[PDB]
From Swiss-Prot, chain B:
Protein origin, superkingdom: Eukaryota
Shown residues in whole-protein numbering: 127 to 174 of 319
Modified residues (N6-acetyllysine): K24
Family, as annotated: Belongs to the eukaryotic ribosomal protein eL8 family.
Subunit structure: Component of the large ribosomal subunit. Interacts with CRY1. Interacts with DICER1, AGO2, TARBP2, MOV10 and EIF6; they form a large RNA-induced silencing complex (RISC).
Taxonomy of the source species: Eukaryota, Metazoa, Chordata, Craniata, Vertebrata
Organism of derivation: Oryctolagus cuniculus
Cross-link (Glycyl lysine isopeptide (Lys-Gly) (interchain with G-Cter in SUMO2)): K24
Localization (cell): Cytoplasm
Role noted for this protein: Component of the large ribosomal subunit. The ribosome is a large ribonucleoprotein complex responsible for the synthesis of proteins in the cell.
Name listed for the protein in its UniProt record: Large ribosomal subunit protein eL8
From Swiss-Prot, chain C:
Organism in which the protein naturally occurs: Oryctolagus cuniculus
Designated name of the protein: Large ribosomal subunit protein eL36
Family listed: Belongs to the eukaryotic ribosomal protein eL36 family.
Top-level division of the source organism's lineage: Eukaryota
Assembly with partners or alone: Component of the large ribosomal subunit.
Gene designation: RPL36
Residue numbers of the full-length protein present here: 54 to 103 of 105
Swiss-Prot record, chain D:
Organism from which the protein derives: Oryctolagus cuniculus (Rabbit)
Gene3D superfamilies with a match to the protein in the record: Ribosomal protein l15e
Compositional bias per record (Basic residues), positions renumbered to this chain: 168-181
Name of protein: Large ribosomal subunit protein eL15
Matches recorded under SMART domains: Ribosomal_L15e
Record PTM Phosphoserine, positions in chain: S33, S96, S99
Main localization, broad class: cytoplasm
Length: 210, 48, 50, 203
RNA sequence: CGCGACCUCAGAUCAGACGUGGCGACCCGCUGAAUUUAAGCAUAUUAGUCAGCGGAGGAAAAGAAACUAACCAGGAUUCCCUCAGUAACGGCGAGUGAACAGGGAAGAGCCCAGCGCCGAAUCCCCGCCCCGCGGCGGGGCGCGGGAAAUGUGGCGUACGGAAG
RNA sequence: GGCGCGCCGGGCCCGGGUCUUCCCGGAGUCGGGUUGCUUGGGAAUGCAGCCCAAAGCGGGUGGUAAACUCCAUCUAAGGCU
């Protein structure tokens, strides 16, 4: 029975909720497991990074997040082949592999051919046996000095190029900001109506001649 | 039942003087026996 | 198929389009099929002359 | 070479020839028992797609299934309750008259394991299916690395738990927007996520 | 009339291996209410919940897209935060009710049927010794039986594959 | 038990870049009409029966029925993890 002024409101407790209640009393020594069996992981994989195979330069979609950059799933099959690393050799040296990814612009394709040389250079690669190395395998001084990495490998931070303070020319100031947004809206919507009547008016001149 | 014409051509068969003659030319061009493959595979390791 | 190749012989190619639709599928599923039947029909309207 | 033409000719049932063959053969399954073994596979093409090979181990049973629908079981026809639920004569079964084959092969032959099934004839009261199964202890199958996925204790009675390709279809799964009521594992566990209270500690 | 091959089908206390039944707290497949809310009550609500039947495991189920998008594009599955008590339903009444983007935990990816090249190159069982094993596996020797061209094994499957 | 490292004993004859010529895939299923259950999915989100039942520049999807159209994006009717 509502008294007086006071917001109307709909609860969903009409089912038998109590029989399905979830609690997190676990919450503290469920963390302290992950962190343990986390701590197991990389003692198993000694000088390989615990940061694992490296994630590509990838955007966020739609008009909201399309200003941003983030880590992805895997490197496309025209970024691996151009650089000089094969798809089944790339798995065997910390470089990500995904069979689906696309190349639609060359502004996010040149950014992922350079990404793989940075890496290929700064890697340290051990010999098959300790007592007999070969050709591409690195020397026994780096390998002395070489050691594990912590946190994402070459992590992608948020970037923007700066600009100076400029004296404005006499045709920037003579450019409308609102009336050029309204004459691009007008001609996008009405172009379907435009073209059929430039056709039907030019149709009648053809008929009355012949 | 009205057996249709494509499955009906299997009753059409080769006669007696041709069927006992056609298995005498194929008698000279048989595959070798399973016991022949123990003196042919073995016959390479005698000469080499 | 035989029955739709008997409205195509006698040129009622609408009723035939409107007959194939109910059987096989949509208006464009009954288009190429009506274009296929016409072309085998047109085949045996050559191989009789020759 | 020959398996390119065997596929394309079974896809011509409304021809003259296949109309005759799917008729003689179907007369000749109303005559034999409602579950019975079959010496070799009838459509050797279509079988070999769904996994079969010819080797001392595999096997086929050929089961028949009564055709039609479901009628709701109550004494005389008296479902006691509200009016929505008076329904008995136009309701249907959620799984299929395929999978009911895969299962009855399954139950009878309890040593063997189900793998897949396929169509072979129909009448007006009967639908007929062939049904691949595997002896999971024949040394042939125990010792081909590829096959041994079936020998393992989890794949017991696949047919009974919606796992075979005829099985899977009722549980309402695929990828995308058309299947939202499964995200989670399976239908049940979509429902569960949506109906807990998630009571943390501080609140 | 006999003799022999196949095909489809009997019988055995024939030689060797498998299934049944139990527990059921969490998982999978079915089938399936009414009390009760609407201040009456038939659609709605309870609720795909109670009871019924069936199958499992140390977790199950899902799983490398006939996927989301409408972007300067994300890229298997599960899980937490958020998106939201929203967009959508609803005697438009009571009432119910998502996803995608964003950020985390975890992170791993692959095999055939089919087109066709390599003298079935492939597998199962048996008699005999050497070793040897309380997960019957290792080598040699069988004019030893059988499966198989109604198709076995090797290269190989959309990220394309092959020969020269 | 578990990693590392010799001595005998068993296998295995194998790898990438340019040029020419071949060659490519799941059917009573996809798809619809209708009937009943289901869903937040509205001229029908998913499932099933009975009827009709394909295509190969072809087939699904693109949240309001359809005709006439260019684009954008996945390869369905077999399998493991």
């Amino acid at each position: 029975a509502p008294s007086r002024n006071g917001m109307i409101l709909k609860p969903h407790f009409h089912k038998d909720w109590q029989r399905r209640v979830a609690t997190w009393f676990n919450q503290p020594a469920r963390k302290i497991r992950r962190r343990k069996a986390r701590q197991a992981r990389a003692r198993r994989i000694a000088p390989r990074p615990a940061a694992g195979p490296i994630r590509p330069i990838v955007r966020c979609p739609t008009v909201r997040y399309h200003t941003k950059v983030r880590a992805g799933r895997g490197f496309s099959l025209e970024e691996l082949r151009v650089a000089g690393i094969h798809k089944k050799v790339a798995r065997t040296i910390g470089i990500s592999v995904d069979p689906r990814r696309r190349n639609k612009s060359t502004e996010s394709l040149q950014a992922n051919v350079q990404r793989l040389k940075e890496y290929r250079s700064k890697l340290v690669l051990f010999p098959r046996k300790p007592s007999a190395p070969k050709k591409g395998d690195s020397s026994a001084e780096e390998l002395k000095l070489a050691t594990q990495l912590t946190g994402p490998v070459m992590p992608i931070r948020n970037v923007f190029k700066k600009e100076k303070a400029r004296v404005i020319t006499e045709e920037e100031k003579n450019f409308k900001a609102f009336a050029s947004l309204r004459m691009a809206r007008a001609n996008a919507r009405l172009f379907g109506i435009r073209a059929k009547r430039a056709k039907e008016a030019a149709e009648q001149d053809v008929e009355k001649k012949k | 039942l009205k057996v249709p014409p494509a499955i009906n051509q299997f009753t059409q068969v080769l006669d007696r003087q041709t069927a006992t003659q056609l298995l005498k030319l194929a008698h000279k061009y048989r595959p070798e026996t399973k016991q022949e493959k123990k003196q042919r595979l073995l016959a390479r390791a005698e000469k080499k | 198929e035989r029955r739709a190749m008997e409205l195509l012989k006698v040129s009622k190619d609408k009723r035939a389009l409107k007959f194939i639709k109910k059987r096989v599928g949509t208006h464009i599923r009954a288009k190429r099929k009506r274009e296929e039947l016409s072309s085998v029909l047109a085949a045996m309207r050559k191989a009789a002359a020759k | 070479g020959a398996y390119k033409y065997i596929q394309e000719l079974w896809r011509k049932k409304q021809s003259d020839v296949m109309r005759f063959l799917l008729r003689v053969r179907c007369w000749q399954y109303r005559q034999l028992s409602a579950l019975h073994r079959a010496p070799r596979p009838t459509r050797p093409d279509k079988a070999r797609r769904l996994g079969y090979k010819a080797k001392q181990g595999y096997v086929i049973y050929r089961i028949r299934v009564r055709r039609g629908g479901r009628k709701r079981p109550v004494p005389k026809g008296a479902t006691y309750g509200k009016p929505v639920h008076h329904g008995v004569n136009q309701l249907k079964f959620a799984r299929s008259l395929q999978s009911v084959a895969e299962e009855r092969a399954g139950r009878h032959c309890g040593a063997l394991r189900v793998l897949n099934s396929y169509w072979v004839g129909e009448d007006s009261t009967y639908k007929f299916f062939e049904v691949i199964l595997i002896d999971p202890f024949h040394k042939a199958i125990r010792r081909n690395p590829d096959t041994q996925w079936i020998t393992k204790p989890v794949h017991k009675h696949r047919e009974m738990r919606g796992l075979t390709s005829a099985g899977r279809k009722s549980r309402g799964l695929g990828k995308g927007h058309k299947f939202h009521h499964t995200i989670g594992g399976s239908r049940r566990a979509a429902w569960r996520r949506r109906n807990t209270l998630q009571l943390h500690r501080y609140r």
